[PDB]
Every structure is written in structure tokens, then in C-alpha cells.
Amino acid sequence: IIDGAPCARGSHPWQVALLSGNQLHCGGVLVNERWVLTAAHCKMNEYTVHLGSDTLGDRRAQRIKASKSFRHPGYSTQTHVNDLMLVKLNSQARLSSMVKKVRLPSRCEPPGTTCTVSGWGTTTSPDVTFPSDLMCVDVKLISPQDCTKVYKDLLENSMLCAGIPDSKKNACNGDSGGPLVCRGTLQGLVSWGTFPCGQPNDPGVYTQVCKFTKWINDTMKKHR
């Protein structure tokens, strides 16, 4: 998270971390007791899922192994279209005051809506600065017409753009697969952006969750 601030304690109980060898790999969201939603580019054979704390490594946090994951069949490694994946936890996540299910959307929020993106990714770019505490930043949704002026042929109807005009406020490396929440519902998952991160007037690109709710529910039903 660039140009952000630490999240207020206990305001992101649906936020999870995906670790490989106790190192942060990606962010994510808890959909229910057995499933975590993240980006498809976060694919691994095994996962260590951190839940229940704004601080990574906190003894009070929950740590669950995840041995199975299912990427969207339309996911492309080359164009990054359909960048979403369901991660199946080996045991049920225990719902608490620090662990809650995310509210999946029924509608797509219009451009100009104020949202929050969160994560444990680098707080600086190109320089690396990994925080221990969960970072937050408020971004506004940018219309596909305005976002096309920036990324052109790279965008698809299932990609959502967000940012603040003439501002560094954005997501970065380590935040991938993490939530973009607008008006109480999950609107996006961190997919891609610029390198270095937080370049003014260069938005962050997210997987538009409102276009995949059928696949999310269908895939979860198919397995277990």
C-alpha cells in the first residue's frame, strides 16, 4: 500500500494473508469457513493462510493449511484476464470478532464511488518496505472510459480501475489478491498496476468481483 496508513484495529476481519515458507505471497478475502478468494496469479501447490489479526505472525491469529486451489478457467497468464482463484482451507476458519465472512456483491458500484484497498505489501516503490501491520488506502472507482485513456487494449469489461487524481495512493507488490471494498461489499481483488507503484494518474487494476459471483458460488458447490 503506497501513501496509506495502518488500518483501524479490527476493521478488516475478512482480510487474509497467503504465505509460502512463512513469507508473504499474496493477500485475500474469506468468503466462508472453507474458502478464500484471491488472484489467480497467486497460484501455489500449498498455502499457509493467516486470518484474525492486523499484525502478521501474531500468536492470536489463525494459521490454516490449504492444499487445493481452483483458478477461473478463463484465466490467462499473458493478458491477466479473469484473475481470480478460490483457495480451499484444509479445516474450517473459526469465525470470531477478528474473523468474519466478506459480503459478496449483488451489484457493480459506479465510477466515483469511494472504496478502501488493504494489504501487507510494500509501503514504498521501487524501494522495498514490508510492514508487519495491515495498511489501508482510500481510492475512488475510475470509469472504463477514463482508465482506457491510460491502459488502452489491456483492459477487459471484467477489470475494475481505482485511484485518486494526481496521487500516489495505490496497492503494490504483496497486496495482490487483496480486497477493494466499496459501500459494504467486495468490489475488487488486487490484480495489477504500475512498476514503480503509486505513479500519479496511473490507476490500480482489480478483478471486478460483481462479474464472477455465479462462478464463485458454482465452484464452491462443485468442491465439498
mmCIF file of C-alpha atoms in Angstrom:
data_model
loop_
_atom_site.group_PDB
_atom_site.id
_atom_site.type_symbol
_atom_site.label_atom_id
_atom_site.label_comp_id
_atom_site.label_asym_id
_atom_site.label_seq_id
_atom_site.Cartn_x
_atom_site.Cartn_y
_atom_site.Cartn_z
ATOM 1 C CA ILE A 1 0.000 0.000 0.000
ATOM 2 C CA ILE A 2 1.521 3.331 -1.173
ATOM 3 C CA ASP A 3 0.650 6.704 0.529
ATOM 4 C CA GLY A 4 -1.588 4.811 3.003
ATOM 5 C CA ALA A 5 -1.859 4.423 6.796
ATOM 6 C CA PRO A 6 -2.338 1.389 9.161
ATOM 7 C CA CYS A 7 -5.934 0.059 9.123
ATOM 8 C CA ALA A 8 -8.047 0.759 12.195
ATOM 9 C CA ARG A 9 -7.857 -2.272 14.567
ATOM 10 C CA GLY A 10 -10.431 -4.996 13.724
ATOM 11 C CA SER A 11 -11.961 -3.226 10.696
ATOM 12 C CA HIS A 12 -10.787 -5.911 8.179
ATOM 13 C CA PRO A 13 -11.831 -9.323 9.726
ATOM 14 C CA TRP A 14 -12.359 -10.788 6.208
ATOM 15 C CA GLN A 15 -8.765 -9.949 5.132
ATOM 16 C CA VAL A 16 -6.374 -12.943 4.956
ATOM 17 C CA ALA A 17 -2.685 -13.456 4.007
ATOM 18 C CA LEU A 18 -1.330 -16.282 1.809
ATOM 19 C CA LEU A 19 2.212 -17.334 2.842
ATOM 20 C CA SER A 20 4.878 -19.560 1.238
ATOM 21 C CA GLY A 21 7.647 -20.590 3.682
ATOM 22 C CA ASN A 22 6.385 -18.005 6.265
ATOM 23 C CA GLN A 23 6.943 -15.242 3.650
ATOM 24 C CA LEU A 24 4.016 -13.090 2.385
ATOM 25 C CA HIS A 25 2.942 -14.215 -1.092
ATOM 26 C CA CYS A 26 -0.494 -12.586 -1.564
ATOM 27 C CA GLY A 27 -3.499 -11.018 0.145
ATOM 28 C CA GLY A 28 -7.023 -12.467 0.031
ATOM 29 C CA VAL A 29 -10.596 -12.473 1.365
ATOM 30 C CA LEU A 30 -12.530 -15.021 3.405
ATOM 31 C CA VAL A 31 -15.792 -15.907 1.564
ATOM 32 C CA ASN A 32 -16.818 -18.599 4.111
ATOM 33 C CA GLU A 33 -15.410 -21.076 6.698
ATOM 34 C CA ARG A 34 -13.843 -23.264 3.903
ATOM 35 C CA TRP A 35 -12.986 -20.746 1.168
ATOM 36 C CA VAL A 36 -10.642 -17.854 0.481
ATOM 37 C CA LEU A 37 -10.912 -15.717 -2.698
ATOM 38 C CA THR A 38 -7.707 -14.270 -4.235
ATOM 39 C CA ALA A 39 -5.994 -13.571 -7.616
ATOM 40 C CA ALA A 40 -5.151 -16.445 -9.984
ATOM 41 C CA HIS A 41 -1.537 -15.170 -10.370
ATOM 42 C CA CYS A 42 -1.146 -16.100 -6.614
ATOM 43 C CA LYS A 43 -1.371 -19.836 -7.574
ATOM 44 C CA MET A 44 0.749 -22.295 -5.494
ATOM 45 C CA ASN A 45 0.583 -26.033 -4.741
ATOM 46 C CA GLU A 46 0.293 -25.345 -0.955
ATOM 47 C CA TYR A 47 -0.667 -22.257 1.123
ATOM 48 C CA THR A 48 -0.390 -21.086 4.726
ATOM 49 C CA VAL A 49 -3.421 -18.914 5.437
ATOM 50 C CA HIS A 50 -3.132 -16.143 8.060
ATOM 51 C CA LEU A 51 -6.503 -14.883 9.489
ATOM 52 C CA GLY A 52 -7.666 -12.984 12.613
ATOM 53 C CA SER A 53 -5.022 -10.238 13.052
ATOM 54 C CA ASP A 54 -3.837 -6.944 11.508
ATOM 55 C CA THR A 55 -0.252 -7.960 12.503
ATOM 56 C CA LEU A 56 1.452 -10.824 10.636
ATOM 57 C CA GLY A 57 2.938 -13.504 12.897
ATOM 58 C CA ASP A 58 0.606 -12.621 15.836
ATOM 59 C CA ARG A 59 0.193 -15.710 18.073
ATOM 60 C CA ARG A 60 -3.561 -14.832 18.465
ATOM 61 C CA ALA A 61 -4.022 -15.145 14.653
ATOM 62 C CA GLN A 62 -5.283 -18.318 12.934
ATOM 63 C CA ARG A 63 -2.981 -20.331 10.650
ATOM 64 C CA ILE A 64 -4.615 -22.841 8.276
ATOM 65 C CA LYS A 65 -3.009 -25.028 5.586
ATOM 66 C CA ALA A 66 -4.700 -25.013 2.151
ATOM 67 C CA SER A 67 -3.779 -27.917 -0.168
ATOM 68 C CA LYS A 68 -6.262 -27.263 -3.049
ATOM 69 C CA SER A 69 -6.946 -24.185 -5.247
ATOM 70 C CA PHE A 70 -9.132 -23.573 -8.326
ATOM 71 C CA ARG A 71 -8.389 -20.819 -10.875
ATOM 72 C CA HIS A 72 -11.013 -19.310 -13.223
ATOM 73 C CA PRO A 73 -10.983 -21.444 -16.448
ATOM 74 C CA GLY A 74 -10.641 -18.232 -18.484
ATOM 75 C CA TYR A 75 -7.505 -17.058 -16.614
ATOM 76 C CA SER A 76 -4.619 -16.015 -18.890
ATOM 77 C CA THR A 77 -1.019 -15.740 -17.589
ATOM 78 C CA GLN A 78 -0.200 -13.460 -20.604
ATOM 79 C CA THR A 79 -3.103 -10.911 -20.544
ATOM 80 C CA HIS A 80 -4.179 -11.356 -16.828
ATOM 81 C CA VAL A 81 -7.903 -11.625 -17.786
ATOM 82 C CA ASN A 82 -10.117 -13.492 -15.212
ATOM 83 C CA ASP A 83 -7.560 -13.008 -12.441
ATOM 84 C CA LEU A 84 -9.380 -14.820 -9.613
ATOM 85 C CA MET A 85 -8.928 -18.104 -7.731
ATOM 86 C CA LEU A 86 -10.707 -19.980 -4.935
ATOM 87 C CA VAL A 87 -8.494 -21.427 -2.211
ATOM 88 C CA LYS A 88 -9.936 -24.366 -0.195
ATOM 89 C CA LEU A 89 -8.838 -24.417 3.504
ATOM 90 C CA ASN A 90 -7.910 -27.919 4.861
ATOM 91 C CA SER A 91 -10.007 -27.139 8.006
ATOM 92 C CA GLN A 92 -12.761 -24.588 8.808
ATOM 93 C CA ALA A 93 -11.816 -20.997 9.719
ATOM 94 C CA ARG A 94 -13.228 -20.094 13.136
ATOM 95 C CA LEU A 95 -15.474 -17.060 12.960
ATOM 96 C CA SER A 96 -14.744 -14.530 15.721
ATOM 97 C CA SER A 97 -14.576 -10.749 16.418
ATOM 98 C CA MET A 98 -11.390 -10.763 14.238
ATOM 99 C CA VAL A 99 -12.516 -13.395 11.629
ATOM 100 C CA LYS A 100 -15.676 -12.653 9.526
ATOM 101 C CA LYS A 101 -17.019 -13.573 6.044
ATOM 102 C CA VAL A 102 -16.807 -10.842 3.368
ATOM 103 C CA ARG A 103 -20.083 -9.584 1.865
ATOM 104 C CA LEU A 104 -20.011 -10.577 -1.824
ATOM 105 C CA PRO A 105 -21.696 -8.007 -4.135
ATOM 106 C CA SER A 106 -25.107 -8.174 -5.837
ATOM 107 C CA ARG A 107 -24.404 -5.014 -7.957
ATOM 108 C CA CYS A 108 -21.414 -3.214 -9.571
ATOM 109 C CA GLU A 109 -20.546 0.116 -7.896
ATOM 110 C CA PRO A 110 -20.475 3.078 -10.330
ATOM 111 C CA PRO A 111 -17.400 5.263 -11.116
ATOM 112 C CA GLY A 112 -16.680 7.890 -8.433
ATOM 113 C CA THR A 113 -17.527 5.520 -5.511
ATOM 114 C CA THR A 114 -15.078 5.761 -2.557
ATOM 115 C CA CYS A 115 -13.521 2.394 -1.675
ATOM 116 C CA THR A 116 -10.757 1.006 0.568
ATOM 117 C CA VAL A 117 -7.929 -1.300 -0.507
ATOM 118 C CA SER A 118 -5.852 -3.149 2.142
ATOM 119 C CA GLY A 119 -2.699 -5.294 2.445
ATOM 120 C CA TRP A 120 0.726 -6.227 3.861
ATOM 121 C CA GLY A 121 2.566 -5.394 0.598
ATOM 122 C CA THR A 122 5.448 -2.918 0.269
ATOM 123 C CA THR A 123 4.703 0.615 1.590
ATOM 124 C CA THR A 124 7.336 2.119 -0.854
ATOM 125 C CA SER A 125 8.283 1.689 -4.569
ATOM 126 C CA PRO A 126 10.708 0.872 -6.218
ATOM 127 C CA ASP A 127 12.375 0.558 -2.705
ATOM 128 C CA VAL A 128 11.021 -2.436 -0.671
ATOM 129 C CA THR A 129 9.435 -1.798 2.784
ATOM 130 C CA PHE A 130 7.311 -4.709 4.099
ATOM 131 C CA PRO A 131 5.063 -3.719 7.079
ATOM 132 C CA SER A 132 4.041 -6.047 9.948
ATOM 133 C CA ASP A 133 0.699 -4.204 10.347
ATOM 134 C CA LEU A 134 -2.131 -4.159 7.774
ATOM 135 C CA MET A 135 -2.129 -0.947 5.635
ATOM 136 C CA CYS A 136 -5.218 0.883 4.219
ATOM 137 C CA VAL A 137 -5.805 3.460 1.483
ATOM 138 C CA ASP A 138 -8.999 5.092 0.126
ATOM 139 C CA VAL A 139 -9.388 5.127 -3.655
ATOM 140 C CA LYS A 140 -12.258 6.156 -5.986
ATOM 141 C CA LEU A 141 -13.516 3.927 -8.859
ATOM 142 C CA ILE A 142 -12.438 5.168 -12.298
ATOM 143 C CA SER A 143 -14.774 4.707 -15.326
ATOM 144 C CA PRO A 144 -13.594 2.248 -18.054
ATOM 145 C CA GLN A 145 -13.587 5.267 -20.474
ATOM 146 C CA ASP A 146 -11.077 7.186 -18.255
ATOM 147 C CA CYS A 147 -8.998 4.047 -17.442
ATOM 148 C CA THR A 148 -8.727 3.169 -21.206
ATOM 149 C CA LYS A 149 -7.008 6.590 -21.728
ATOM 150 C CA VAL A 150 -4.214 5.044 -19.558
ATOM 151 C CA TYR A 151 -4.014 1.241 -20.193
ATOM 152 C CA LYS A 152 -5.860 1.063 -23.625
ATOM 153 C CA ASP A 153 -6.135 -2.540 -25.108
ATOM 154 C CA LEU A 154 -5.024 -4.127 -21.752
ATOM 155 C CA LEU A 155 -8.463 -3.676 -20.130
ATOM 156 C CA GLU A 156 -11.410 -6.055 -20.292
ATOM 157 C CA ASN A 157 -15.057 -5.495 -19.153
ATOM 158 C CA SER A 158 -14.300 -7.702 -16.023
ATOM 159 C CA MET A 159 -11.401 -5.409 -14.870
ATOM 160 C CA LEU A 160 -12.100 -2.513 -12.436
ATOM 161 C CA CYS A 161 -9.876 0.597 -12.052
ATOM 162 C CA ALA A 162 -9.354 2.737 -8.918
ATOM 163 C CA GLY A 163 -7.208 5.650 -7.716
ATOM 164 C CA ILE A 164 -7.118 9.353 -6.681
ATOM 165 C CA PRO A 165 -6.261 12.151 -9.245
ATOM 166 C CA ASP A 166 -2.614 13.403 -9.067
ATOM 167 C CA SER A 167 -1.984 10.990 -6.134
ATOM 168 C CA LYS A 168 0.408 8.135 -5.220
ATOM 169 C CA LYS A 169 -2.421 6.350 -3.207
ATOM 170 C CA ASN A 170 -2.415 2.732 -4.562
ATOM 171 C CA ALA A 171 -1.753 -1.030 -3.997
ATOM 172 C CA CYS A 172 1.706 -2.664 -4.588
ATOM 173 C CA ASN A 173 3.714 -5.991 -4.565
ATOM 174 C CA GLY A 174 2.363 -8.241 -1.779
ATOM 175 C CA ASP A 175 -1.181 -6.744 -1.890
ATOM 176 C CA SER A 176 -2.106 -8.938 -4.929
ATOM 177 C CA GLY A 177 -5.388 -10.807 -4.441
ATOM 178 C CA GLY A 178 -6.404 -8.440 -1.632
ATOM 179 C CA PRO A 179 -9.773 -6.667 -1.152
ATOM 180 C CA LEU A 180 -11.173 -3.441 -2.608
ATOM 181 C CA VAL A 181 -14.354 -2.797 -0.548
ATOM 182 C CA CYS A 182 -16.974 -0.214 -1.544
ATOM 183 C CA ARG A 183 -20.162 0.625 0.407
ATOM 184 C CA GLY A 184 -20.090 -2.598 2.456
ATOM 185 C CA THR A 185 -19.388 -5.064 -0.412
ATOM 186 C CA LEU A 186 -16.279 -6.605 -2.001
ATOM 187 C CA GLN A 187 -15.923 -4.896 -5.360
ATOM 188 C CA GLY A 188 -12.407 -5.925 -6.407
ATOM 189 C CA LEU A 189 -9.310 -8.107 -5.906
ATOM 190 C CA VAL A 190 -5.821 -6.518 -6.454
ATOM 191 C CA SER A 191 -4.659 -7.753 -9.872
ATOM 192 C CA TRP A 192 -2.037 -5.430 -11.405
ATOM 193 C CA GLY A 193 -0.676 -1.892 -11.590
ATOM 194 C CA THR A 194 2.441 0.070 -12.473
ATOM 195 C CA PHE A 195 6.040 -0.554 -11.503
ATOM 196 C CA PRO A 196 7.131 1.517 -9.620
ATOM 197 C CA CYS A 197 3.770 1.504 -7.792
ATOM 198 C CA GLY A 198 1.830 4.670 -6.959
ATOM 199 C CA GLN A 199 2.519 6.650 -10.123
ATOM 200 C CA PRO A 200 0.116 9.680 -10.165
ATOM 201 C CA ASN A 201 -2.857 9.320 -12.590
ATOM 202 C CA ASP A 202 -1.932 5.624 -13.269
ATOM 203 C CA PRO A 203 -4.740 3.609 -11.595
ATOM 204 C CA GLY A 204 -4.648 0.192 -9.916
ATOM 205 C CA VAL A 205 -6.351 -2.645 -11.825
ATOM 206 C CA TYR A 206 -8.673 -5.065 -9.956
ATOM 207 C CA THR A 207 -10.711 -8.162 -10.851
ATOM 208 C CA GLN A 208 -14.361 -6.882 -10.852
ATOM 209 C CA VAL A 209 -15.959 -9.364 -8.357
ATOM 210 C CA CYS A 210 -19.610 -8.442 -9.364
ATOM 211 C CA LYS A 211 -18.984 -10.199 -12.786
ATOM 212 C CA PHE A 212 -17.979 -13.583 -11.240
ATOM 213 C CA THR A 213 -20.491 -14.293 -8.431
ATOM 214 C CA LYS A 214 -22.007 -17.243 -10.396
ATOM 215 C CA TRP A 215 -18.540 -18.857 -10.913
ATOM 216 C CA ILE A 216 -17.627 -18.215 -7.216
ATOM 217 C CA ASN A 217 -20.847 -19.919 -5.933
ATOM 218 C CA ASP A 218 -20.756 -22.712 -8.583
ATOM 219 C CA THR A 219 -17.042 -23.620 -7.956
ATOM 220 C CA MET A 220 -17.570 -23.664 -4.146
ATOM 221 C CA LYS A 221 -20.585 -26.012 -4.597
ATOM 222 C CA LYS A 222 -18.676 -28.310 -7.044
ATOM 223 C CA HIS A 223 -15.913 -28.974 -4.427
ATOM 224 C CA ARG A 224 -17.161 -30.255 -0.963
#
